[PDB]
Design goal:
heterotetramer, A alpha/beta (about 525), B alpha/beta (about 500), C mainly alpha (about 325), D little secondary structure (about 5), C: about 325 residues, globular, D: about 5 residues, little secondary structure, about 0% helix, rod-shaped, binds farnesyl, binds chloride ion, binds zinc ion
């Protein structure tokens, strides 16, 4: 069966088209609005008629029908807690009202929050009421510590804490003091219940920090080029700010571009250098880059007979892959780790635990737990097969970092990464100074555009991979040898991008299907006339 | 009362919990019932007493007549069965008054003065969140006549210290005593117990050993073992599948009304019987306190009880007769084997586990040690329970007895409290009471000598923590009396 | 740990769906018919079956909804709202009849909804929602009018809705939700701000949405919905992490959600089917590569065809 | 047929 509920509707339209901002409709609305609380149009007509007495009719009808609503709303929410329409009307109503009845709000909230600890509509409304009645952050920070102890799956709860704690205490994610505490509060959140993603996610976010920045300044004499690398991708010459160059303690206007000249947000930017900034009139030249908008400043000096000079921020000295745990912190984490291996014995198939065991090792001593970390990924890859791709790129990222750290420590520009089963490349913007890069024997399916940051790359050994795309090789100033034997370069069009490598002389491609095309050696010589030797 | 109708469908003698329930069932069922009791108060051995009421009660069991006049009323073709004329269920009544008369010191006169602020139960029992009685209370709405309060904690006494036992998800979390590792083991294992049936082969091999030998093999520290064994499972010998069934009931009760499995009637357990008696009255039941019955008038031929004769000589006819054990002659019960319950009722000036929020009903379990010794459960009541004056706690101890109540419970009491004295860290004991109650529960009806078929017997309390026994026999009885018959907002809390 | 269990519908029933949507409209759904038509039309189109819908009637209906303020209402008589405004521009954009409504008003209606923080209210009754920061930017984009608003400010707002886990919620402070990540990543793509999104982080949170049944949910501790398949995959494609999902497991789930009888797709295997999920089911398969569904745009949820025509297609993440 |  079915009831003609539409009739009441067509009625409200008629009883409106003229200007009946009365109550004869304000009631008929509750009729449809009861079943279809998502019929936004109605919440309007109602929101209309009734504001036609909130400045008109006697306060003994208005202030009265006022509460008459706060009752109706609860009645709607009861049957439909999830509904942007309802909750909005309430926000609207409780906004207009002259008297701040907020007191009863923080209770109506706790009411629905208890019924459904996972109703974002309610937490959003509470956030509203809290902001209105100016509830102290600490006050709310307690409401969460309680909702967390009783509940088993409270993500909305931890999420909120992530917003509250920052605004209570302004390296680490939170102040050493607040941090070490919050950790303990979470360490048992998942020990009590490890099948609660919540605790696990929040826990990950607690091991990181934020970034302030000019992270490198390189100057090649032969290229008469000055290269600059930023912490994150920004756009020089626009809001964010721009770059100023000071050569020999005097400004020098330069144009700034990205490797592909499209000048979109990027880690790398560069400018050409005039003869004066590189000639012999002085025993040396001083370059000083100043990024406004953060004012990060970098400065390097180019001696009379040196081919290049730079000023880079060591990933190590900047703790980008670690965090240099303070004697105290270190101990709490070292304790955090051990406790987790136990949790694994009890909960062997808990992917979250295994994973967190890895993140903990990355936080303590990435290089030390290298053998271990790799063993856990194996374990993890087995218990959680659906995230094999994820784990792989993650293992790849960490593997890269360890290598970068070794290179910085060894103080060289050769980055070895052969036989690491790498599936992706990361932090390429840290590689700017690298001259030789070996990425052969891995599972890379592509060299990425981000590879453009490698302004000193002379040789690129990427043989034996699953490379199907080599687009990121484009625009590499110093690239002279590009080895790509045995890969998956199918068509010769996949080599098109290489015509942007002005110094490319050796191009080994043997092993790719593309060599099977007829006249491939001739087609390529046409396409890359500058490349002296092209083995195919 | 001295001019009762001469006809009734069923007569109930005694106002204990079981008799009361059954009395209500039959009234709601359309049956005309006459409910009488000898005492001048409701409840039999389930009764509640003010302090003055308690003093009188124990006094009549420390002191120690031919009146057979109904004989001229026994027809030629009839036989009579004399009932008991004196109650012999309480024994070894021992009392101690440590208070000053018999920092804010409480004196004996204070208790006397405040005597009505007390409600000492002879029966020490907690209500289970989800048990037969609680449902019955709700389904019959008898609960309307009573408010309830949640037991705010389970406790364990070890190494001469009282501590709180973590038993809920929230407790384990906040606990700062369970090593991170433990919180997992416990939480893991408990989640198993509620579903122990879902893992038939996770204990199967142990389906033939001590539930304590089993818990020794599981992934539980010894600490957590004690907890699950005594504090949660509360099982004394106990079979492996027994502790599981127990812990399961505990866990399925946890949460329903609070952070614990139990409730406590406001004003005491003694209120429960009176609730059902009220319904009984509501549906036409006729009540008579201080109204004893002399004998049962058995029909010489059909051999069925056909009526009774009360103290006023009135001859009252009924179809059924329910009689609480106590009201039967030493003869009728010459064959019955009984058990004895050791009881202690202490009045103290402080909680066993001192805290900032001192208004709370907690329960402790002291595991026996001796072979024939049993598990002693001590239930501490705060004044808010409405069973004792402000500034004091009413602590009840119970256990199946070996010897006299005092010999069974004195040791525990001396380990938990210290006798008050002018020699002005555990609470102070101001007044202790020990006594033994007869346990006539779980006795086969055929053990009674010559009672007609239409005469049923209700038992008194049992040493069991809850009231499932009282509800069961009442429903069993209701089966035999009213065949193919039948026995809604929930309770109210403090 | 609460996931569904696929029974023993493993094959894409194109025609069966084609019939469902083509026969749909022939009750209480009216308060959103504009978007309703938009789902049915878009899905049919992705199935090279757009010719089975009354363009004329739809076009007349669209015009009938553009109220004298620019905004478009879900249905004739109802109130104008960004949502139905976008749904309509889309209907018209894929019907190339984008001349039926007053484009100048629509662009006015949109800017008239941006606040000083950059956000966008749903309608005149001020309902700030990143869900609407998308509708605005998407509508303008499909009209080459993305300049009408304060793009710099609208971006600042959307970025302030980023949570500790990489995702985005309804408004500053809100909880990361799948449907809200789509709108913010879609808006971030349209406004060339993807370099702000943290691909690795949000990408992880996003793949974790996939349960053992193969399906995906909208947030931690929830059941898979074939509709979150679209919303999660689309966000993944935009941020370039689509390879982090198990294409197969998901393909089986999505396929199971279809009624081998009535046609169309259902939220979960066995429940009722509707046009909303029929679109996101077909849409989801499209993003995973299917030789029977035209490539769908992971930003406008329309045929990548229709979008290459209007020459509107933000470059996604590398 | 939507919700949130
Ligand atoms: C009722 C639906 C939600 C709360 C999820 C929010 C997502 C949207 C509103 C997407 C609209 C955009 C298009 C694909 C046209
Ligand atoms: Cl009980
Ligand atoms: Zn859905």
């Amino acid at each position: 069966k079915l009831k003609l509920y539409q009739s009441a509707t067509q009625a409200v339209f008629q009883k409106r088209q003229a200007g009946e901002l009365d109550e004869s409709v304000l009631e008929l609305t509750s009729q449809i609005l009861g079943a279809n609380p998502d019929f936004a149009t109605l919440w309007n007509c109602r929101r209309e008629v009734l504001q036609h007495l909130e400045t008109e009719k006697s306060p003994e009808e208005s202030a009265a029908l006022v509460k008459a609503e706060l009752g109706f709303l609860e009645s709607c929410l009861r049957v439909n807690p999830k509904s942007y329409g309802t909750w909005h009307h309430r926000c609207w109503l409780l906004s207009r009202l002259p008297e701040p009845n907020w007191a009863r709000e923080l209770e109506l909230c706790a009411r629905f929050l208890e019924a459904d600890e996972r109703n974002f509509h309610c937490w959003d409304y509470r956030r509203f009421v809290a902001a209105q009645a100016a509830v102290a952050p600490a006050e709310e920070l307690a409401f969460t510590d309680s909702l967390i102890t009783r509940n088993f799956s409270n993500y909305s709860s931890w999420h909120y804490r992530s917003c509250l704690l920052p605004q209570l205490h302004p390296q680490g994610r939170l102040p050493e003091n607040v941090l070490l505490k919050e950790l303990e509060l979470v360490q048992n959140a998942f020990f009590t219940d490890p099948n609660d993603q919540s605790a696990w996610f929040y826990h990950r976010w607690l091991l990181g920090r934020a970034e302030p920045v000019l992270c490198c300044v390189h100057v090649s004499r032969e290229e008469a080029c000055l290269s600059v690398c930023f912490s994150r991708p920004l756009t020089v010459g626009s809001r964010m700010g721009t770059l100023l160059l000071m050569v020999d303690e005097a400004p020098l206007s330069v144009e700034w571009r990205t490797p592909d000249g499209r000048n979109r947000p990027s880690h790398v930017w560069l400018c050409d250098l005039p003869a004066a900034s590189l000639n012999d009139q002085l025993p040396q030249h001083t370059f000083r880059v100043i990024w406004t908008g953060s004012d990060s400043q970098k400065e390097c000096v180019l001696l009379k007979d040196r081919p290049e000079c730079w000023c880079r921020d060591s990933a190590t000295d900047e703790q980008l892959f670690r965090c240099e745990l303070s004697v105290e912190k270190s101990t709490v984490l070292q304790s955090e780790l051990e406790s987790c291996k136990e949790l694994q014995e009890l909960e062997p198939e808990n992917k979250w635990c295994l994973l967190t065991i890895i993140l903990l090792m990355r936080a303590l001593d990435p290089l030390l737990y290298e053998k271990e970390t790799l063993q856990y990924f194996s374990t993890l890859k087995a218990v959680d097969p659906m995230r094999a791709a994820y784990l792989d790129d993650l293992r790849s990222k960490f593997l890269l970092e360890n290598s970068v750290l070794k290179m910085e420590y060894a103080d060289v520009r050769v980055l070895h990464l052969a036989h690491k089963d790498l599936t992706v490349l990361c932090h390429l913007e840290q590689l700017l100074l690298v001259t030789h890069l070996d990425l052969s024997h891995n599972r890379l399916r592509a060299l990425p555009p981000a590879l453009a940051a490698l302004r000193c790359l002379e040789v690129l050994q990427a043989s034996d991979n699953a490379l199907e795309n080599v687009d990121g090789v484009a625009n590499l100033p110093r690239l002279q040898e590009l080895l790509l034997c045995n890969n998956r370069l199918q068509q010769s069009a996949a080599i098109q991008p290489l015509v942007s490598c002005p110094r490319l002389v050796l191009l080994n491609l043997q092993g790719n299907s593309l060599c099977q095309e007829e006249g491939i050696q001739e087609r390529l010589a046409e396409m890359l006339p500058s490349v002296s030797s092209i083995l195919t | 009362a001295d001019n009762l109708p001469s006809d009734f469908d069923v007569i109930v003698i005694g106002t204990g919990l079981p008799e009361s329930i059954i009395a209500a069932a039959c009234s709601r069922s359309g049956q005309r019932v006459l409910h009488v009791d000898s005492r001048s108060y409701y409840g039999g051995n389930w009764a509640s007493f003010s302090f003055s009421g308690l003093l009188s009660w124990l006094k009549e069991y420390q002191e120690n007549t031919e009146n057979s006049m109904w004989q001229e009323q026994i027809l030629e073709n009839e036989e009579a069965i004399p009932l008991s004329s004196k109650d012999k269920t309480i024994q070894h009544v021992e009392v101690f008054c440590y208070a000053s008369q018999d920092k804010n010191r409480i004196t004996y006169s204070q208790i006397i003065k405040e005597g009505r602020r007390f409600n000492i139960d002879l029966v020490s029992k907690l209500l289970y969140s989800r048990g037969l009685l609680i449902d019955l209370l709700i389904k019959s709405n008898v609960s309307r006549y009573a408010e309830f309060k949640n037991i705010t904690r389970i406790l364990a006494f070890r190494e001469g210290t009282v501590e709180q036992v973590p038993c809920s998800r929230a407790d384990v979390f906040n606990s700062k005593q369970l090593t991170m590792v433990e919180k997992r083991m416990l939480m893991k294992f408990l989640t198993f117990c509620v579903e122990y049936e879902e893992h038939p082969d996770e204990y199967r091999a142990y389906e033939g050993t001590t539930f304590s030998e089993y818990l020794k093999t599981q992934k539980l520290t010894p600490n957590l073992q004690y907890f699950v064994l005594h504090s949660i499972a509360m099982t004394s010998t106990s079979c492996t599948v027994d502790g599981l069934k127990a812990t399961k009931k505990f866990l399925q009760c946890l949460g329903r009304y609070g952070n614990t499995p139990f409730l406590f009637p406001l004003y005491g357990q003694g209120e429960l019987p009176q609730c059902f008696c009220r319904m009984c009255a509501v549906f036409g039941g006729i009540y008579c306190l201080r109204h004893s019955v002399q004998c049962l008038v058995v029909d010489k031929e059909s051999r069925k009880c056909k009526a009774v004769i009360d103290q006023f000589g009135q001859r009252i006819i009924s179809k059924h007769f329910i009689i609480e054990d106590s009201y039967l002659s030493e003869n009728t019960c010459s064959r019955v084997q009984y058990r004895q319950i050791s009881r202690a009722v202490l009045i103290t000036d402080g909680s066993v586990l001192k805290t900032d929020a001192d208004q709370q009903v907690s329960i402790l379990t002291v595991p026996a040690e001796e072979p024939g010794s049993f598990a002693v459960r001590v239930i501490e009541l705060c004044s808010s329970t409405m069973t004792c004056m402000k500034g004091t706690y009413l602590v009840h101890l119970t256990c199946m007895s070996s010897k006299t109540a005092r010999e069974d419970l004195e040791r525990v009491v001396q380990k938990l409290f210290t006798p008050y004295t002018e020699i002005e860290e555990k609470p102070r004991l101001l007044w202790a009471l020990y006594f033994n109650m007869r346990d006539s529960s779980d006795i086969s009806r055929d053990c009674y000598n010559d009672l007609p078929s239409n005469v049923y017997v209700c038992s008194g309390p049992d040493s069991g923590l809850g009231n499932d026994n009282a509800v069961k026999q009442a429903e069993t009885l209701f089966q035999q009396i009213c065949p193919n018959e039948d026995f809604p907002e929930d309770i109210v809390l403090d | 740990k609460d996931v569904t269990i696929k029974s023993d519908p493993d094959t894409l029933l194109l025609e069966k769906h084609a019939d469902y949507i083509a026969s749909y409209g022939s009750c209480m759904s009216e308060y959103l018919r504009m978007s309703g038509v938009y789902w049915g039309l878009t899905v049919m189109d992705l199935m090279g079956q757009l010719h089975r819908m009354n363009k004329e009637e739809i076009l007349v209906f669209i015009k009938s909804c553009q109220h004298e303020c620019g905004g478009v209402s879900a249905s004739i008589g109802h109130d104008p709202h960004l949502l139905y405004t976008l749904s309509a521009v889309q209907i018209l954009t894929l019907y190339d009849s984008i001349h039926v409504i007053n484009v100048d008003k629509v662009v006015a209606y949109v800017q008239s909804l941006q606040k000083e923080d950059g956000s966008f209210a749903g309608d005149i009754w001020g309902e700030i929602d990143t869900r609407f920061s998308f509708c605005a930017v998407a509508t303008l984009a499909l009209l080459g009018k993305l300049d009408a608003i304060n793009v710099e400010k609208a971006i600042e707002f959307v970025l302030s809705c980023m949570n500790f886990d990489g995702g985005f919620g309804c408004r500053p402070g809100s909880e990361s939700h799948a449907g809200q990540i789509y709108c913010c990543t879609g808006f971030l793509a349209i406004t060339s701000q993807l370099h702000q999104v943290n691909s690795d982080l949000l990408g992880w949170w996003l793949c974790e949405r996939q349960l053992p049944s193969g399906g995906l949910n909208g947030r931690p501790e929830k059941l898979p919905d074939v509709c979150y398949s679209w919303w999660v995959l689309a966000s993944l494609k935009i941020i370039g992490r689509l390879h982090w999902i198990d294409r197969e497991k998901l393909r089986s789930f999505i396929l199971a959600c279809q009624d081998e009888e009535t046609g169309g797709f259902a939220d979960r295997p066995g429940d009722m089917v509707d046009p909303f999920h029929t679109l996101f089911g077909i849409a989801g398969l499209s993003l995973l590569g299917e030789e029977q569904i035209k490539p769908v745009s992971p930003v406008f949820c329309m045929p990548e065809e229709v979008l290459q025509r209007v020459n509107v297609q933000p470059e996604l993440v590398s | 047929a939507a919700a949130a």
